[PDB]
Amino acid sequence: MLPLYLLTNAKGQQMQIELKNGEIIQGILTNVDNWMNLTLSNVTEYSVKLNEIYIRGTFIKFIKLQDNIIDKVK
Amino acid sequence: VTTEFLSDIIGKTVNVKLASGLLYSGRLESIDGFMNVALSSATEHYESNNNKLLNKFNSDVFLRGTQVMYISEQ
């Protein structure tokens, strides 16, 4: 099935996001839309603790999904 | 307003800068929706016209939409 669909399914799961600039962004997913604009809660980034963040779709390189992405979603 | 401006500056000598820093000085033939410029008698320069002239083009020069940054005039 689709990646977007999977993302939608996994609402309230941990995922480490990587951007084009360099930084690592760890957080639990809250909401997803058609262009993959990722909103995370309980957010922490690396080379800073946050309550909530907004992440753009095009700026992402990849998303390190957890091992139980098939078990929880599907 | 933009459209009006475009309409106005047809058949005038215009400074057109691209993303790389190449300033094009020449007579404006035409321009359309995505900001694709059509110059004529163009004389390209690095940054400013006071600096050295690299190449000269008597024929109708074409500047692409995504590359162009602004269209000024003398």
């Binding site: - | 933009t2 995504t66 000024s72």
Partner: protein
């Protein structure tokens, strides 16, 4: 209720404005007009290259394209 960016832009017409692009390049001058894509009409703009270098002084009306613009600062 909430203040729109478009409204702000409109308000800044016929006043001095500093338009910062995504690259380390800036433009300072008087605002004439705009549209939905933020394709700014800037009268007598001064081209700055930051980190400051004065590039070129424009004597006319500059159509600043809406792709490269990052920040718009009235005054």
């Amino acid at each position: 209720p909430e203040i729109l960016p478009l409204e702000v832009i409109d308000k800044t017409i016929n006043q001095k404005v500093l338009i910062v692009l995504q690259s380390n390049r800036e433009f300072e001058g008087t605002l004439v007009g705009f549209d939905d894509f933020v394709n700014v009409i800037l009268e007598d703009a001064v081209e700055w290259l930051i980190d400051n270098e004065k590039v070129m002084q424009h004597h006319g009306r500059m159509l600043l394209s809406g792709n490269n613009i990052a920040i718009l600062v009235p005054g």
